[PDB]
Design an enzyme around this catalytic site. Structure first.
Site, short mmCIF file in Angstrom:
data_model
loop_
_atom_site.label_atom_id
_atom_site.label_comp_id
_atom_site.label_asym_id
_atom_site.label_seq_id
_atom_site.Cartn_x
_atom_site.Cartn_y
_atom_site.Cartn_z
CB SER A 88 6.89 5.64 7.33
OG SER A 88 5.49 5.72 7.15
CD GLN B 210 -5.54 6.53 6.17
OE1 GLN B 210 -6.61 7.56 6.32
NE2 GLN B 210 -5.31 5.38 6.07
CE1 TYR C 94 5.36 9.81 10.32
CE2 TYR C 94 3.26 8.21 9.68
CZ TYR C 94 4.54 8.09 9.19
OH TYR C 94 5.68 7.54 8.24
CG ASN D 215 1.78 8.33 3.69
OD1 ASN D 215 2.21 8.13 4.52
ND2 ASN D 215 0.74 7.44 3.89
CB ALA E 155 3.80 -0.70 9.52
CG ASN F 96 2.30 -3.86 10.52
OD1 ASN F 96 2.79 -3.35 11.31
ND2 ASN F 96 0.71 -2.74 10.13
C1 LIG Z 1 2.50 4.78 10.90
C2 LIG Z 1 1.91 4.95 9.15
O1 LIG Z 1 0.67 5.39 8.76
C3 LIG Z 1 0.74 5.18 7.73
C4 LIG Z 1 -0.67 5.49 6.43
C5 LIG Z 1 1.94 4.67 7.23
S1 LIG Z 1 2.01 4.09 5.48
O2 LIG Z 1 1.30 4.95 4.57
O3 LIG Z 1 3.81 4.74 5.23
N1 LIG Z 1 2.71 2.44 5.31
C6 LIG Z 1 1.49 1.26 4.50
C7 LIG Z 1 0.48 2.78 3.54
C8 LIG Z 1 -0.14 0.80 2.82
O4 LIG Z 1 -0.63 0.38 3.68
C9 LIG Z 1 0.01 -0.09 4.99
C10 LIG Z 1 -1.00 -1.16 6.28
C11 LIG Z 1 -0.53 -0.82 6.98
C12 LIG Z 1 0.44 0.39 7.35
F1 LIG Z 1 1.05 0.62 9.36
C13 LIG Z 1 0.82 1.06 7.22
C14 LIG Z 1 0.10 0.48 5.79
C15 LIG Z 1 2.84 4.37 8.41
C16 LIG Z 1 4.43 3.92 8.49
O5 LIG Z 1 3.86 2.97 7.10
O6 LIG Z 1 4.22 4.00 9.42
#
Ligand SMILES: Cc1oc(C)c(S(=O)(=O)N[C@@H]2CCOc3ccc(F)cc32)c1C(=O)O
Length: 358
Positions: free
Chosen positions: A61, A117, A147, A149, A315, A340
């Site tokens: 992110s 998601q 928050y 995506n 993450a 992570n």
């Molecule tokens: C706090 C948060 O919620 C979401 C949906 C994201 S994410 O979509 O951007 N990141 C990836 C997506 C695909 O695999 C994972 C597996 C675990 C994980 F914690 C993040 C992610 C983030 C973040 O990155 O902080």
């Protein structure tokens, strides 16, 4: 590096790596505008490849900061406006719940409960259209932050439509190339695979999977050197020669909404500096960062406040990253790891390092 930077960094990161069992880590401190780099451990355990200043990590992110700046650049180019309805750039979005939902709402997670998601079932362009047509808001636009995506991801895809470019092509030509981020990628080229660290989840080597809106929401991979340069560019936008990108960086740090102590920018999030560390530290825990929270509109948005703690966590399944900087002190940090591990541990380490140097 000055022994003071060396001391706080090693004194902070060494315990962190052991407590969280991080296989490999890279850290950059920007101090009075200059970067200082640190590396530990393994980019690839199996092949015994060390983390170097050229190792690529998945930013997760933190990619949303590039999306927010690219969007700000499109604003500065006159190609889009944040006050324009989503349907201006996606007329096929005819379902009535989209009336009143603007690009600003998409960019800032305030559309009314767009989900965190995008569903795995969603792939094709028609799959995405169907998902947003069928989505039912829980709240009126501009009233709660969730928050998501599916929110900023959609913002990113729509924000590049008038340019005619693909999201990746626009990001390369308008953000990466002008800033000399020559080892930052949406898709890692075959020539760079030797530098692509593996992420580690439950001891297994993993890379991020493709998914709808992945490029816009969590798709950037980068080195500690480019991320240091990313931080420098966001600390001092006025040194950037391309006018719309300088302006777009400033727009991404404007304060559009307030919830608690935090202000929502475009990708970036901001707090007034000095910060209560427990406030940014506990604030970063997903229990709080991912929750539905009512927002106060900042009418009109406050331009980039130099006395701010500007940051983003990020993450993937196998990576954990954190960026934070204080423009007024020309001070910032990048922490990239191929595990992570919990957000509050990231922020606590970053705060200890930056507080010692401020
Ligand atoms: C706090 C948060 O919620 C979401 C949906 C994201 S994410 O979509 O951007 N990141 C990836 C997506 C695909 O695999 C994972 C597996 C675990 C994980 F914690 C993040 C992610 C983030 C973040 O990155 O902080």
């Amino acid at each position: 590096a000055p022994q003071q930077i060396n001391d706080i960094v090693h004194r902070t990161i060494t315990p962190l790596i052991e407590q969280q069992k991080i296989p490999g880590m890279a850290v950059a401190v920007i101090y009075q505008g200059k970067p200082y780099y640190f590396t530990w451990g393994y980019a690839d355990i199996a092949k015994k490849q060390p983390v170097t200043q050229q190792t690529l990590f998945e930013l997760g992110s933190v990619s949303k900061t590039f999306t927010g700046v690219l969007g700000g650049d499109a604003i500065a180019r006159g190609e889009i406006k944040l006050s324009d309805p989503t349907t201006k750039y996606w007329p096929e979005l005819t379902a009535k719940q989209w009336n009143g939902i603007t690009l600003l709402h998409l960019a800032t997670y305030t559309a009314g409960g767009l989900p965190l998601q995008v569903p795995d079932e969603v792939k094709s362009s028609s799959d995405l259209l169907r998902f947003y047509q069928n989505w039912q808001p829980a709240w009126a636009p501009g009233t709660q932050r969730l928050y998501a995506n599916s929110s900023i991801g959609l913002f990113g895809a729509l924000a590049v439509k008038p340019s005619g470019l693909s999201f990746e092509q626009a990001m390369q030509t308008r953000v990466f190339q002008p800033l000399k981020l020559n080892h930052t990628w949406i898709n890692v080229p075959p020539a760079e695979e030797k530098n692509y660290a593996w992420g580690y989840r439950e001891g297994k080597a993993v890379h991020v999977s493709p998914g709808a809106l992945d490029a816009e929401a969590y798709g950037v991979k980068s080195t500690i050197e480019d991320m240091a340069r990313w931080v420098q560019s966001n600390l001092k936008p006025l040194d950037i020669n391309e006018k719309t990108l300088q302006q777009g960086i400033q727009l991404a740090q404007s304060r559009y909404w307030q919830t608690g102590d935090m202000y929502q920018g475009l990708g970036w999030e901001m707090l007034d500096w000095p910060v209560n560390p427990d406030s940014i530290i506990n604030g970063s825990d997903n229990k709080i960062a991912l929750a539905a929270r009512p927002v106060k509109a900042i009418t009109p948005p406050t331009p980039a406040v130099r006395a701010s703690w500007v940051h983003k966590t990020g993450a993937t399944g196998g990576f954990g990253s954190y960026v934070a900087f204080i423009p007024e002190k020309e001070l910032g940090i990048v922490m990239l790891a191929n595990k992570n591990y919990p957000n509050p541990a990231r922020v606590d380490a970053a705060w200890q390092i930056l507080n010692a140097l401020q």
